[PDB]
């Protein structure tokens, strides 16, 4: 590789010549130029990482370069930010004239200048750089050498144990492992059972609980070819050899160890066992997603962070939220490793003590967290891998966490019913018992009796319909109730009322509440009842299948946020297929923190969440959600009974209620076997038959019959005009008798209109002038019937047609007879901030005068006619 060094001395002979190198990164590449910049006796290597800039970060790599500056340098250009690439080709012009008008600074080509560039090529991709071949044109192409023996040679200049792992942990394949094993064999001959055993234990540590793979087995096989008494609150016999390995890594080396795995199964007890077994350590919860990057160390005088003390003295650290953290800040932290325990400083600016017994430690998020993704690969070669031993084929490991409670009886009741559940179809049941102890440790509302078991069967038994929806799961809940005792929307008699306080059993902590069942069918009615039953409670329904923060958060101003920090609850619907971009924002806002962030905003004095599922595709972050429930869907007689409570003041007609009620529901069964389709949520409800009921008590239809004269609007004309539409008549004549009648009668007056059943008034003193003169159609009188039906019963309408035959024509006809004004609004790009919210006007003067003018007009019309 010193061949490349001499070729680079040959490259520096000509200045104002933009250079560029490509090849493996951190494979000796930058170390060569850093070794050189002192050998050449010129100024020191400056370097600035560019994957995002602001041009006062850049403005200054160039501001440095002036006045006998060293020259500009780039570490990575493959993922360079696209915001700043045009004034960088300005620099590729050697005849540049650089007048920046931000600070009005004029600059010409400097004598000591060299556009050093560094980049990694694509891998298995078909062309990946953010660099153009035209931008490549004025760049001196180079390739970086790579020797295999180098891993033998660093340990040759001084013995170590990461000199093994200096490039070996990158294996994470088989041929790579074998060749690096050959390097380790040549290492084994070089100044052994000591570090052979140590590297064997390290190999066994990289896949302790990462996976059950036998990569460690083949590793130790090819190695055979190459061939404690801590004290804490918890012993954790699983972690005994684990802590032996950790102590040896802390002891033989400064080798920083990096935890990744399942929390609450070794991640937490080990930090306590350590701090009890030894001191000197700043054991602290240090998180960094939104925290300032200097205050993590402390700055302005000069403040002091937590990490500044661990840098000052320590044998251990505990940083969190680290896979969800900024890579640039963490590569600035690259010197607290084997390099001297010291980093960048400005203004304390003194060198800090270093001890090779110091072992910087942190941990990554649990496997269910979305932030455990975005792992930095730079931090998975310079560290030591270790995974939390997960509990499988053990039921005594939960027993220690159940015994810690004041009442030791959970150790008796939890495992037996846990086993009966596992018999009926385990570490996830351990997570549920972990939630159950927290449910019960929260429980002191009663006298604290032996009711914990009565409680914990809901979360485990009743929640089984998710993983396996089956007609026998009720009997499984019954058998779990038998083992339980062995271990020991409307106010309405149906179980829909049991469902009500069944939900309140979950209102213990209640970050989310997930739900399953055909949604809106009793579900939304239940929460509407909840809003009625308790005062001072707002809610707001909110669909989400294709959406954005701007339809949810605004530029600040939005209904979810106007509702948040103001109420206590928001409804939600249709989270079957959400964005998975907003879902990050959802899991970010209100875990128990309140304050949101991606831009940030403070929330949660009190606020709750509701949800649903439409039975797929769903993430584990959806399964992550702390609370899960299955609802009790309705039952045919339950609907009859709420109806028979509401309506029977005149002619209950319960037998006919049953017939129409079975019609709209049996039509759903007929639909799901391909009864044609015009839309996606093409289903039925109670609301249809309730509207049938509402018109059936029309005050005075001007008729003594309305029985089978509502199947024109709710079964018939919803469905497309097609021969299959006759088959709905076949179905509803197979359940009900037949009747046919007069098809049309329209004739109007000056006072009253009359359309086939229904009459309506028309206002004198005004109508709306409608040019493009209209007349009624002999056809489609059936539709203006239903329109007047709607605006007499006050129901919004939607119409669907092939862009002919008159959709706006219908309303515009009738609103010439009787109408007030109509204000058409064509929706072609608008959004929630436009549907209601007008924009903003700078002056807003004569715009406003239109209001008073128009008002005077519309009142003077009526007064002059009067």
């Amino acid at each position: 590789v010193e061949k490349n060094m001499m070729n680079l001395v040959r490259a520096t002979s000509g200045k104002r010549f933009p250079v560029l190198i490509q090849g493996p990164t951190s494979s000796g590449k930058t170390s060569m130029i850093k070794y050189l910049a002192d050998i050449t006796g010129h100024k020191f290597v400056r370097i600035n990482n560019h994957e995002h800039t602001d041009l006062q970060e850049y403005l200054g790599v160039l501001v440095e370069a002036l006045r006998k500056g060293y020259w500009i340098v780039l570490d990575e250009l493959n993922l360079a930010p696209t915001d700043v690439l045009e004034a960088l080709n300005r620099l590729l012009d050697d005849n540049r004239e650089l007048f920046i008008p931000e600070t009005q600074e004029v600059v010409h080509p400097h004598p000591d200048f060299l556009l050093f560039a560094t980049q990694n090529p694509p891998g298995i991709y078909g062309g990946r750089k953010i660099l153009s071949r035209a931008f490549r044109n004025r760049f001196l192409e180079l390739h970086f050498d790579d020797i295999p023996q180098d891993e033998l040679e660093i340990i040759l200049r001084e013995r170590c144990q990461i000199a093994p792992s200096y490039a070996k942990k990158i294996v994470e394949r088989l041929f790579e492992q074998k060749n690096s094993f050959a390097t380790l064999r040549d290492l084994f001959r070089w100044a052994v059972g000591y570090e052979q055993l140590a590297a064997s234990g390290y190999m066994l540590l990289a896949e302790r609980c990462r996976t059950p793979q036998e990569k460690v087995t083949v590793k130790k096989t090819l190695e055979k070819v190459m061939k404690l008494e801590a004290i804490g609150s918890v012993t954790w016999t699983k972690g005994m050899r684990r802590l032996s390995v950790l102590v040896s890594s802390c002891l033989k080396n400064k080798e920083p160890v990096l935890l990744v795995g399942e929390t609450g199964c070794g991640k937490t007890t080990i930090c306590q066992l350590l701090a009890q077994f030894m001191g000197r350590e700043l054991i602290t919860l240090n998180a960094h997603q939104n925290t300032e990057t200097g205050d993590i160390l402390g700055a302005q005088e000069w403040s002091d962070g937590p990490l500044i003390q661990a840098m000052r003295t320590g044998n251990f650290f505990l940083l969190d939220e680290i896979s969800l953290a900024d890579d640039s800040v963490l590569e600035r932290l690259n010197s607290v490793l084997e390099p001297e325990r010291s980093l960048l400083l400005a203004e304390s600016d003194s060198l800090v003590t270093a001890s090779e017994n110091f072992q910087f430690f942190a941990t990554m998020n649990p496997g269910g967290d979305y932030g455990k993704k975005e792992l930095s690969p730079a931090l998975r070669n310079r560290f030591t891998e270790i995974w939390v031993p997960s509990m499988e084929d053990f039921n005594d490991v939960n027993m220690i966490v159940s015994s810690r409670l004041l009442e030791d009886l959970k150790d008796l009741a939890n495992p037996i019913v846990k086993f009966s559940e596992w018999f009926g179809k385990n570490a996830t049941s351990g997570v549920i018992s972990l939630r159950d102890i927290l449910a019960w440790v929260e429980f002191i509302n009663k006298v604290f009796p032996k009711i914990q078991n009565k409680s914990t069967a809901l979360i485990q038994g009743a929640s089984m319909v998710f993983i396996d929806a089956l007609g026998t799961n009720n009997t499984a809940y019954l058998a779990e109730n038998e083992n339980d005792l062995k271990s020991l929307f409307n106010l309405t008699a149906p179980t829909t009322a049991s469902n009500l306080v069944r939900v309140v059993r979950a209102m213990q902590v209640h970050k989310p509440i997930l739900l399953e069942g055909s949604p809106g069918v009793g579900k939304t009615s239940l929460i509407t009842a909840l809003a009625n039953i308790t005062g001072n409670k707002l809610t707001r329904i909110n669909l989400s299948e294709q959406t954005d923060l701007v339809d949810l958060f605004g530029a600040h101003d939005a209904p979810f946020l106007r509702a948040m920090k103001k109420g206590e609850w928001v409804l939600l619907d249709e989270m079957n297929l959400a964005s998975q971009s907003v879902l990050e924002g959802l899991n970010a806002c209100l875990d128990h923190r309140g304050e949101a962030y991606i831009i940030s905003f403070s929330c949660h004095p009190n606020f709750l969440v509701f949800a649903a599922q439409n039975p797929k595709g769903l993430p584990k972050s959806f399964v992550n959600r702390f609370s899960v429930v299955f609802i009790d869907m309705l039952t045919s007689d339950d609907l009859l009974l709420i109806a028979k409570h509401l309506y029977p003041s005149i002619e209950p007609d319960i037998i006919a209620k049953m017939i129409k009620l079975m019609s709209t529901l049996e039509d759903q069964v007929c639909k799901r076997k391909l009864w044609g389709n015009s839309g996606s949520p093409w289903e039925f409800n109670l609301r249809d038959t309730l509207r049938w009921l509402k018109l059936l008590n029309q005050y005075s239809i001007c008729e003594d019959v309305d029985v089978f004269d509502f199947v024109d609007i709710i079964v018939k004309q919803r469905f497309r005009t097609i021969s299959d539409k006759n088959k709905a008549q076949l179905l509803i004549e197979d359940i009900f008798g037949k009747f046919s009648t007069k098809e049309n009668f329209f004739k109007l007056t000056e006072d009253y209109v009359q359309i086939n059943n229904e009459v309506a008034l028309r206002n004198p003193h005004y109508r709306y002038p409608i040019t493009q003169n209209l007349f009624p159609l002999e056809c489609n009188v059936a539709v203006y019937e239903s329109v007047l039906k709607a605006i007499n019963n006050n129901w919004p309408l939607v119409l669907v047609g092939p862009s002919n035959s008159g959709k706006t024509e219908t309303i515009r006809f009738l609103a010439s007879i009787l109408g007030p004004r109509v204000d058409v609004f064509s929706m072609n790009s608008d959004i929630d901030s436009m549907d209601i919210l007008g924009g903003y006007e700078q002056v807003d003067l004569t715009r406003q005068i239109s209001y008073i003018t128009e008002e005077l007009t519309n009142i003077v019309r009526e007064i002059i006619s009067m």
């Binding site: 004025r138 192409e141 862009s803 406003q848």
Partner: protein, 489 residues
Amino acid sequence: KTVSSLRQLGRKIQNSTPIMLIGKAGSGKTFLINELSKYMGCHDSIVKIHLGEQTDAKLLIGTYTSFEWRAGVLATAVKEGRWVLIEDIDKAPTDVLSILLSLLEKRELTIPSRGETVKAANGFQLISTVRNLNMIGMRIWNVIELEEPSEEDLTHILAQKFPILTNLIPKLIDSYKNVKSIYMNTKFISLNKGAHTRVVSVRDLIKLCERLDILFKNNGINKPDQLIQSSVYDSIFSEAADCFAGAIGEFKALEPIIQAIGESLFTNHSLRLMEQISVCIQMTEPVLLVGETGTGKTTVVQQLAKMLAKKLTVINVSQQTETGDLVEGSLVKTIRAGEWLLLDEVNLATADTLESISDLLTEPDSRSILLSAEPIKAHPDFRIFACMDITDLLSIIDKYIGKYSVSDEWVGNDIAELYLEAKKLSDNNTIVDGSNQKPHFSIRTLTRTLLYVTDIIHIYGLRRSLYDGFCMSFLTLLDQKSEAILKPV
């Protein structure tokens, strides 16, 4: 029988109503409407738009100035009452259909966010020319379909206007059928010849105007019986149908010998451009088209700056406000003078006023642009410009100071490598290694002995050929490059 379509248009405007106009690319769709305003008398008062998405989406309807109101253009078009033309509306933003639905709404209506609502006065008329999502636009508009025919009008359209033809009617159709046929396979080889801008018979009408100057290079006569001029105006007659392009040269085999006869062929390569620019300015406005990069173009910038008049350029990528008053715009003076103008790196920040400037220098009347300030028609001595290697082999080695009999295979090395540079390098590092960067890097290679000690160039080229094709070898092909280092010997 175009006049059939013209009478059709007269019928549709008989009741003042909108209309859609559709056809294949370049049937002279603008031709019919540019003809119409002569009859009905709105050319000095029309409102027309190439398309606005990168120079405008709301300024047409206007906006305040902080401390006065400024009424937009289309608002004035409606309110004062006059024609309005939209060009290639299918390309428009859907924001711009949301307003045009209101113009196809009753009252023929427009409504700003000023509290007002603006009604069409009696002289309004909307017209579209097209080459989706607003069906009421497709529903109310009357389609009319243009098609300029083959094989009979292509002689006729000239035969009553520039009646000079005794070898062109066999040749015009032969050029058109084959240029339209090769247009299918040139896009099959879309690497750099790419999506060629489509041919119009208006370009054959430019070639009518090009046959005027060959008779200015001759004299008025029923038949020039000259072979070379019939053969020079074979290649050039075929060339105006083309422009700058990717230059693979498949058509160069067909182009010169295209009727029955022909043969292929400071400034040596620039000579061709230096003469083609003369041909194009000699056939002045309404046309100019260049896609060749401004880097190689600046020799022509210096050329025309010292021929008889001067010129300048203005960057269009940045926001320019010198187009008009703010103090008057400095661009108002070059139009007022006979000084010419180029536009560097067109990005359409403002090109509305410029498309009016395109067709000024012509016999009918056409105003450039108004201000509110120095309105002006045009200048009769003016020509705008627009901006976005085998004889230089000697010129490239001519870079060297000399003083020594150099082997001319220094550049033979360049092409000998460049042949391989898109053939065989074992999938170099992941990607196309190069087939256009290597000659610029070859002249760069000569620049390395500059900024370098006094030492011979014979020792240098064999050290420097290694340095040139260094990563090009990739340590998978390092012996064929060893031969590249031998040719210097």
